[PDB]
Amino acid sequence: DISTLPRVKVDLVKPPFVHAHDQVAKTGPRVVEFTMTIEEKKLVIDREGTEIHAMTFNGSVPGPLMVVHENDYVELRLINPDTNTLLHNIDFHAATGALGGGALTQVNPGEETTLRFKATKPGVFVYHCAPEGMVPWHVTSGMNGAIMVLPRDGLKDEKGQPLTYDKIYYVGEQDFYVPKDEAGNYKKYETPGEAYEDAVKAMRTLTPTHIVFNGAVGALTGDHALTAAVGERVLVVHSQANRDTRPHLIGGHGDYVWATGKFRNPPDLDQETWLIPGGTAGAAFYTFRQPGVYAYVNHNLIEAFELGAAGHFKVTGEWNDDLMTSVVKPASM
Amino acid sequence: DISTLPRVKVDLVKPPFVHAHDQVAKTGPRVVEFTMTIEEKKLVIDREGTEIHAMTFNGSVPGPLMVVHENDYVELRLINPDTNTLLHNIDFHAATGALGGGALTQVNPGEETTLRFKATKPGVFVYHCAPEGMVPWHVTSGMNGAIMVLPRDGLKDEKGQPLTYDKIYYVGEQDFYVPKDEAGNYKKYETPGEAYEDAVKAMRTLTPTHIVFNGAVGALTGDHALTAAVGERVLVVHSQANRDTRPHLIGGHGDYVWATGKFRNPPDLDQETWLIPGGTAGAAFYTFRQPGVYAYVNHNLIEAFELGAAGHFKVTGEWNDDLMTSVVKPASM
Amino acid sequence: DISTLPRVKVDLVKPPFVHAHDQVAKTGPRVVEFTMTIEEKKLVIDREGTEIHAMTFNGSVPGPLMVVHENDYVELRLINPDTNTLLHNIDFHAATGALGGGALTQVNPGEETTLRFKATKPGVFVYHCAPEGMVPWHVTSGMNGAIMVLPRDGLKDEKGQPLTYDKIYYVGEQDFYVPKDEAGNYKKYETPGEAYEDAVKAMRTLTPTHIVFNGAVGALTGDHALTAAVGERVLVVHSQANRDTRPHLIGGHGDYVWATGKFRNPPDLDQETWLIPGGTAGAAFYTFRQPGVYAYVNHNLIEAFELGAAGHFKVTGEWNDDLMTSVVKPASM
Ligand SMILES: O=N[O-]
Ligand SMILES: O=N[O-]
Ligand SMILES: O=N[O-]
Ligand SMILES: [Cu+2]
Ligand SMILES: [Cu+2]
Ligand SMILES: [Cu+2]
Ligand SMILES: [Cu+2]
Ligand SMILES: [Cu+2]
Ligand SMILES: [Cu+2]
The missing domain is CATH 2.60.40.420 (Cupredoxins -  blue copper proteins)
Incomplete structure (x- = not known):
């Protein structure tokens, strides 16, 4: 029963660095809370000054690494501010059901949503945006990251x-x-x-x-x-x-x-x-x-x-x- | 001595479905007989109505899945009707010798042939057409399938x-x-x-x-x-x-x-x-x-x-x- | 202390053949000496007579296979004759440090160098030329081979x-x-x-x-x-x-x-x-x-x-x- 579990709020860091975590779990199962803000922005990607319109989780390409333990619950609040122009969502390859969360997290500009899933399998896993009809475009504009589920x-x-x-x-x-x-x-x-x-x-x-x-x-x-x-x-x-x-x-x-x-x-x-x-x-x-x-x-x-x-x-x-x-x-x- | 083994005739089904089979073998080793008819035909492959001339085993792309057990014998009768225009053959990656059977199964339109091989290695394996000088053309026109050899x-x-x-x-x-x-x-x-x-x-x-x-x-x-x-x-x-x-x-x-x-x-x-x-x-x-x-x-x-x-x-x-x-x-x- | 180890000189052979070696080591650890001469030359690579300027170790594409045992020392004398025109070096994926030896083996035409490294990991490994700023060009002109480190x-x-x-x-x-x-x-x-x-x-x-x-x-x-x-x-x-x-x-x-x-x-x-x-x-x-x-x-x-x-x-x-x-x-x- 999830309401009796400890909650812990994690503040993410920019890649290639990774937020603080314990390798060996020092607590029982927890609900681990993360917040990510979608940011569409211009990015200069080479020495010649070539510019693209990047679609990012938390302002970076890639999005930040999230770190949990096996059988923790991940609770992600995903914010799409109204300065953005596109509909976005999130698919965790770590999760089971609803297209990895993609079917439950569609947010227009000005919207937010909170998804929870149980991290039942240990490993590193990709997460990425996957809106219907525009999946590769969002992904190849930079809208992907990873999550590590440690044993x-x-x-x-x-x-x-x-x-x-x-x-x-x-x-x-x-x-x-x-x-x-x-x-x-x-x-x-x-x-x-x-x-x-x-x-x-x-x-x-x-x-x-x-x-x-x-x-x-x-x-x-x-x-x-x-x-x-x-x-x-x-x-x-x-x-x-x-x-x-x-x-x-x-x-x-x-x-x-x-x-x-x-x-x-x-x-x-x-x-x-x-x-x-x-x-x-x-x-x-x-x-x-x-x-x-x-x-x-x-x-x-x-x-x-x-x-x-x-x-x-x-x-x-x-x-x-x-x-x-x-x-x-x-x-x- | 193969003449004392049971023979069983299997009727193949269209992919993505698979013919009936037992996971755990309920008999000793058998000779499993299959028949496949080559069919060259027009195929519409996308929503825009793009057409190719497909080269198929048994009318489908892919060809049908064949299922046997380890140390069964596979006996394939391969028919090339005279409504076709090309020479075809078959290479089983499951088999040992003669280019996977390719060297023994060259059939002009109007011909047939019967190949037998022993399924000595368990696994799923590709089979595909491989006529000399035209291998990738036949394969990339759809002339490939698979065979499963269960333990x-x-x-x-x-x-x-x-x-x-x-x-x-x-x-x-x-x-x-x-x-x-x-x-x-x-x-x-x-x-x-x-x-x-x-x-x-x-x-x-x-x-x-x-x-x-x-x-x-x-x-x-x-x-x-x-x-x-x-x-x-x-x-x-x-x-x-x-x-x-x-x-x-x-x-x-x-x-x-x-x-x-x-x-x-x-x-x-x-x-x-x-x-x-x-x-x-x-x-x-x-x-x-x-x-x-x-x-x-x-x-x-x-x-x-x-x-x-x-x-x-x-x-x-x-x-x-x-x-x-x-x-x-x-x-x- | 390396000066008390046996030294053995090996003469390399042209691929696809491999120099004589023992699978099971019949001696203790050795210093194995190899010599390779860089040769830039014209090569005809297809039946139509297409010609490239190949960059080779020992005159062949690929370079020759070197064979040692785990915890032998490899000592390679690399010669770049003054009939060549380019700067070359060598990177062994088998070795530890200095960009696989690349940082220590830069030889202009007219120069030679001798590198020694310990073969601490068993396996087959690529070696290839990797000069700064021109890595893929040298590699895709044929300047690569392999080394086998047997247990x-x-x-x-x-x-x-x-x-x-x-x-x-x-x-x-x-x-x-x-x-x-x-x-x-x-x-x-x-x-x-x-x-x-x-x-x-x-x-x-x-x-x-x-x-x-x-x-x-x-x-x-x-x-x-x-x-x-x-x-x-x-x-x-x-x-x-x-x-x-x-x-x-x-x-x-x-x-x-x-x-x-x-x-x-x-x-x-x-x-x-x-x-x-x-x-x-x-x-x-x-x-x-x-x-x-x-x-x-x-x-x-x-x-x-x-x-x-x-x-x-x-x-x-x-x-x-x-x-x-x-x-x-x-x-x-
Ligand atoms: O999570 N599928 O792209
Ligand atoms: O079975 N070789 O393509
Ligand atoms: O050894 N790196 O290309
Ligand atoms: Cu998106
Ligand atoms: Cu995905
Ligand atoms: Cu064919
Ligand atoms: Cu093949
Ligand atoms: Cu070079
Ligand atoms: Cu390399």
Whole structure:
């Protein structure tokens, strides 16, 4: 009986960071309350200044990672302010019934709604907008995120022993399909509604114009590179709501990978590259062993280095020459 | 010695339905006799009235699901009537030797042949036409199906306990490559032979014009929606003979999934979305827990909702508010 | 302390053959020395005489398979002769740190370098060139190979029992993106540097013009078909450095498959087709049971039979009618 359960309000954070949570549950089942505000806005997605009308949960692409435990109840208040122009909803792949909540959450501009569902299956799962007749348009305009449902006793390895992460990051990868004129130049529009027919034509080519992490080319580089120290155990959650991807840590591995993201399955070990199907969230666990810069990419290297699907880690600590060393530096011969 | 084995004649049914069979074998090994008649015909594949010359086993796209047990013998009589125009054959991925039977089954119009093979490996497997020099053309014109080889003691979960399905459906997903004129309009032809050179050009773009379940856009909707009741255990067999797909039940899960379709492997649990590689059949087991409409899609959502890869389930029974409920219905605020 | 370890010099062989090695290690850990010479050269890749400027390790596409054991040290001397025009390096997905060795191996024409790394994870792994700013161009011009790191006690099945192969072949699959003029004819260039801007445009379509095994259409056919005898256990290593593939043995199976190529995981059994993600090497084990011709393909059949991703096995021995037989040969009805 849900009225006797504890309620807890969580304030979400912007990706690639993740709100505070316990790996091993320190309470019994709870009702976990989240609020998300839909925001349609202009977004500059590349170094050339290409602009789209993005459709976001909570102002970001991707939307923020929600974290609960198995058999918690998720209660989401979804707000569509009247500064928006479109009807939106939300589908949780984590949930059972009513098109993942999509049938119960249709909100016009000026409306709100509150949905509750029980998190019966552990794993990372995609959530995305899915309004009838306009599903791929909303999703490929950035309206997707993920939710992690941890087992109550946390993550386990292939032998059933505990795996504890020191840091967690969320990487949302987004395929965009920006419309082009006859010559190949990107088109610009005053409103999202304007772009609609051109967007359908662009999607139907099945060829994205950009593929990005965290909403833009170069978003997870420089000042915004992911950080870690040698010896730290890092969990990287990665989602793609529409299209296959194949993540890879350049200079590293996935020590433990749930490529299709469901924790009741044992992880795959020692992965170089793993396939996350479109419409799925996956998770990879790695212990850093060397300092320096690492790139984290989609290993279709055209998608990575030409279309934008590349981010960086900056890792501090001590170099281990046993693992790798330059015996003779590049020289004439 | 095969002459002392029981023979049983099976009459095939049209997909998405599956002929009657026992999960757990009630007899020893048998010779299972099937007959299939090749039919080239015109097919209307979308709501706009686009027509192709389909190449079918038994008049349907996909061809019908055949069901046997491990170490049964399959004996297929394949008939190519003289109303057809092309040479056809059959390749079973279930079989060992002679290009899956392809080298032994080449039939001109007016010919027939009978092939026998032993079903030595359990799983769901693709079968498809594969005539020398024209393999992708026949396959992408609809000439493919699947065969299920059940273990003699039926399906088992990841712990080795029995999994029994109440209903089974077969979803054949088909990529078509309809040729286009300069402006983007679909071309029409009087005979299959006419389309050949244009078809090669269309295939080489690697970009399907349509992707459909059961031979047409909207085929598994409305009156032809798949049905189930809350509490029923449903097995969905899904094949794609040429191109990757990523099925997903909107509002549900794959409780037990054999994504690459081979039952000696333990299933993957609690899948949201799973990848079936091109040239493979997969299978997903689900117990319905909520009533209502569910969509079953390829979760590249452009492929689903723009190109045609979407079907429906209509599920009857009682709503369970513990799993999901609307706490505050959409309203102003 | 590495100076007390045995050193062994290995001479590499051209794919699809693999240098001599022991499955089960007959020595303790060693430093295994390899030398590779970079060669930029013209390559004819199809039956029409289309030419590209290939960038190769050791003169071949793919580069040669290197074979070591877990916890051996790999010492690679990489030579870039001054007859080349470009800067090259090497990234081993097998290695830990410095972008897989990429940051430590940048060699201009006229330079050499020697890298050492410890092979801490067992599996097959891709290696590829990855120079800063030009990663996909070098990779999709053929500059990739694989390295196998065997467990010290060799391969094991899903029950932990030994699997011993009689033959091993390496199939490198390569996506090429040859630039086209307005009409669709392939362009020719005097130097690699000439093609650069046209190549970027071609890659950005995400649509390969050719997909080949061992560097050319038809390379593994005829005189160059792979061979085996009925009863032999064959390991096929397959890599794709940039793009997904889905291998399939026509008339056979993958009895034991490590689709993502990492031997600490149990194999998948009885696969018809398996997905190797771009940026991965996989391995399939099969025991031949029937003689004759088999085709080994990427089972996107357009990619196989139109774009080039098809090779042959020629298998000798005795036909087994229990497994398959023609009951009634094709005849009028
Ligand atoms: O090793 N990364 O492309
Ligand atoms: O949740 N289906 O797109
Ligand atoms: O059965 N091979 O396409
Ligand atoms: Cu929306
Ligand atoms: Cu979805
Ligand atoms: Cu045919
Ligand atoms: Cu096939
Ligand atoms: Cu290079
Ligand atoms: Cu790489």
